[PDB]
Design a protein around this motif. Structure first.
Motif, PDB file in Angstrom:
ATOM      1  N   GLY A 252      25.378  41.883  34.766  1.00  0.00           N
ATOM      2  CA  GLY A 252      25.445  43.638  34.455  1.00  0.00           C
ATOM      3  C   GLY A 252      27.017  43.338  35.403  1.00  0.00           C
ATOM      4  N   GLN A 253      27.518  43.016  35.487  1.00  0.00           N
ATOM      5  CA  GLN A 253      29.243  43.678  35.342  1.00  0.00           C
ATOM      6  C   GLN A 253      29.520  43.576  34.382  1.00  0.00           C
ATOM      7  N   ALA A 255      28.052  43.642  31.174  1.00  0.00           N
ATOM      8  CA  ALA A 255      27.954  44.474  30.279  1.00  0.00           C
ATOM      9  C   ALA A 255      28.493  46.579  31.144  1.00  0.00           C
ATOM     10  N   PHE A 256      28.764  47.012  32.363  1.00  0.00           N
ATOM     11  CA  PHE A 256      29.401  47.598  32.847  1.00  0.00           C
ATOM     12  C   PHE A 256      31.002  47.026  31.880  1.00  0.00           C
ATOM     13  N   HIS A 257      31.256  46.592  31.379  1.00  0.00           N
ATOM     14  CA  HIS A 257      33.191  46.154  31.174  1.00  0.00           C
ATOM     15  C   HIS A 257      33.066  46.077  29.250  1.00  0.00           C
ATOM     16  N   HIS A 310      31.534  48.889  22.193  1.00  0.00           N
ATOM     17  CA  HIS A 310      31.057  49.592  24.261  1.00  0.00           C
ATOM     18  C   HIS A 310      29.397  49.453  23.249  1.00  0.00           C
TER      19      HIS A 310
END
Lengths: 310, 309, 310, 310
Positions: A252-253, A255-257, A310
């Protein structure tokens, strides 16, 4: 024609390569000599677009095993052979939220997703039920050769022996799954684990892995030969699973970056897919604390900071 | 964006009838103010990023933004403070359990701004050092800017019932206070009261559709054209909504629909199609897991008909 | 008499006291100034046999709060007033296996035992239902005075004020219990928590606590006055609970070495009961990492090593 | 004699036996036919005091396997041979608070207690490191014969064969323990599990098991032969462990009602020890939901309600 320059793009790729080459590194294996013999200075990048455009920088001619980068491939093969409804009858699709090697199941007594060890073992069991292991291995090898456009795909006997004599956590997970009856009827757990260890020891190069990821990026059609190797549903499900729980709890992290479908292996290989654009493989034996190559992570972050994506 | 808001509206109007023929389950029953709406209410609102609008059904009946306000409050906090300061207190990864679980991550922080603990902490980060009246005024002005001066109001009847029945929220707040998860100089009771006030803000399907459309557009209101949010705030909000917008169901949703959607206990589904549109679906009936049956069916039919994903 | 001589035994207790005095110690409170102002040099022992025989060594005249040593007493009061079947309708009788301040219930959505914080809150909610806190406190204080044989029992207002403004975990536990419908019908949670804080602030000396322990060991009959204060069922259940889960997750280990009903408080107090033999109180502010007084634990270990008891 | 009359006591035993005989029963195995062939009407009780006084009523000459009643015996053997400080270096002494077959360890990465499956496996590993399994089995059999006063102790090959090919949970637990390196240096996990399965298949009669429990009651001295078979520390630790976690999570509740050291097997056998008084074995195939004989539990409750004991 998706990226009709391939001159400034490759220039930026080399710039990011040089920028990420400055990273020191970290411990690689520290538990077996098979993966501890690789010098930390090895670092290579391979890019393949959906048009056949290829670019390799660094040392992309050194084969390395696909430790955890084969789970999306085996899941795609299982989905293509069987069907989404049947393959997801035995495994879930939600992230577990814990480590990949934890011994627990969801509320339905099924593995949380095909990316965790239990899900990978079940998916391996689902492939070609009631057949000898040699035929299964030949089928998987020919499928990988067709997916990679007849590039270099081989076997590493020493790595396979090391994993089969060192991986007792997978034996515990397999016995736990057998106790809960998570396997299809008429399967042998020991043979399933042997086939899983054989699959984990398949070795490829950086260019072959880049073409393999570009096949998923294109949508099941090989960018080199043009032959259809996977159904669109299998590719879509594989990309969804990789985006959801590709990097496990850290995913998840990620996917945040970065926000791209990527898979990380123990052998320091990051296989990332930019849908409808391209695929990349970054090899760097040194690893960080959580089992990812520091150079690959730095390269991915720099790339997502440079280009929009992204 | 869509050069066919005529046949596309026909497709919407046929998926509406397709989803209407459902029985479903319960409504809410946790507060009397939500177990009153008739089960037959069913409305859909759509606003493209270019300003074109289309509504069908009961799109003029106000309803509270129970759990659909978490993305908006997170966006407000990130816009006011910044990503690195906001995430200094909360994580950005799914927890893998229910939204009202009483546990923190390995860093003694809430897992994400979508669970109750993360939502409370994010609420504590908005307009620090000021009383609740000014905080509510600031949030309401921000929401009015977000919705393009559409109908946004307050439901005091829902607020009173919610405030006196949030025992789990009080337990979570005390747990967070004991673990030092709040910024220095914060009154926990006031933070919980402000959280209850924020959860009681009510809108129609039109204003919620405009909010989703302005999230899709990248902080620019499709109607007015005024920039309300920074690109980083909307990008982080969309990432969080895609990752853990539906709690433990989220991944499964991303397996089928693959769009950023948020679900409330008042039978509201707020979904965003980035660079394309924003939609709001209202159906007070809820299934066993906590989502509107009509809304989920509409989402599945929409993703099956049009490519999207 | 239980001790026909009571002269050699006093010499043994004195030499055990001298041996245990040589310990250095650790931290005391670190959380409230009322319990953190006690000097580490304080160390006292009080012994009362079931026949009324008494012996005090050290500084046993310094009052201290019954922080967590009041749980067995309040459970005994509740069982005596209500009955075993009604009291255990709301709380269990089994160890939780985790930390005492954990936020979780058993398979029946009830507190695991009356010794954890949730069980203690439920038990103090069960006492004197339908009455205001003033009469509840009066009733509890009269019961304690009857238990101690009209010895010194008092209230520490400074400690109560320090606790009531710092019990965030207790408030979270109370709200969690209220949500799960773990309280009897018609109860105010905040009033129950305030009464719990008041009960935890009752202070005694070593002599009164020794008399209470001797009363528990005697079967509800006060050794000094000779009048019954508790029913046999109440004292038997209290002793069983203290033996099972008196020291929380360390309790079993205690039963492996000492094998006696002992209760420990955060104010450096150890209430020990030797059934049909005597009752003892050990006070030493110096606490260890797990929340027990080092001098008290050393004294208990040396006592069980020297004399058989059990 | 500790029991001077031994005529009214036997009469009360017969009355309790008749009262318990009216219970219906429950499912016995429902997973294997080897344990499902026993008719539910079988029910027997044997009592042996510390003075050699014996009394048995029912079918006390029908052999049955010691499934979970051998864990205290193997722990006592290991402690006597090795020592408490060395035995507890690998296993804990605290109840886990969860099911007996859960795959988790304490904060020190050790089994919680020797009564759980992981603790039992480690304890079996501790016995006679680096020796053939035949010698280990001969040593254990001769120790059991000496402890039981040369009564009937035999082997059940059919039960051992059925268990060794059905218990994959034990294999998962063993592999999990091997991953965490909880075993002593230089041991084979497969051989350890084979020896554990062999030990679990040892069969005795109710009279022999009663004598075996009376040996622990007497304090290591056989009530019949009078020869010292165990050290006092070994039997004390065994009794403490049985009282703490004899019946797993239910054990504490048992201590609230019966308050005696008892061990229950899945073969419908309850072995209870009244220290310094006697030892009893109760056999009843009928089993309840949590794995205990209904007739045995009812008999224990009636016995503790009739006489004081405790």
């Amino acid at each position: 024609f998706v990226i009709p320059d391939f001159m400034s793009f490759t220039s930026h790729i080399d710039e990011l390569y040089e920028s990420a080459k400055k990273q020191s590194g970290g411990k690689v294996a520290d538990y077996i000599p098979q993966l501890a013999k690789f010098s930390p200075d090895l670092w290579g990048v391979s890019v393949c677009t959906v048009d056949g455009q290829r670019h390799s920088i660094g040392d992309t001619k050194v084969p390395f095993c696909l430790q955890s980068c084969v789970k999306p491939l085996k899941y795609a093969i299982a989905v293509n052979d069987l069907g989404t409804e049947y393959v997801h009858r035995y495994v879930g699709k939600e992230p577990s939220g814990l480590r990949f090697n934890k011994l627990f199941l969801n509320e339905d007594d099924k593995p949380h997703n095909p990316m965790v060890n239990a899900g990978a073992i079940v998916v391996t069991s689902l492939i070609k039920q009631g057949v000898n292991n040699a035929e299964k291995f030949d089928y998987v090898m020919q499928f990988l050769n067709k997916m990679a456009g007849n590039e270099y795909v081989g076997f590493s006997n020493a790595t396979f022996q090391s994993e089969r004599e060192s991986g007792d956590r997978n034996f515990a997970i397999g016995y736990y799954l057998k106790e809960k009856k998570c396997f299809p009827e008429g399967t042998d757990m020991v043979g399933i684990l042997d086939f899983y260890f054989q699959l984990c020891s398949i070795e490829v190069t950086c260019e072959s892995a880049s073409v393999m990821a570009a096949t998923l990026a294109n949508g099941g059609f090989c960018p080199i030969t043009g032959e259809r190797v996977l159904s669109p549903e299998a590719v879509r499900n594989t990309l969804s699973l990789m985006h959801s729980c590709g990097m496990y709890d850290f995913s998840g992290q990620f996917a945040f970056h970065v926000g791209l479908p990527a898979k990380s292996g123990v052998a320091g290989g990051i296989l990332l897919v930019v849908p409808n654009v391209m695929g990349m493989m970054c090899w760097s034996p040194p690893l960080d604390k959580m089992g990812n190559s520091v150079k690959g992570i730095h390269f991915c972050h720099d790339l997502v900071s440079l280009c929009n994506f992204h």
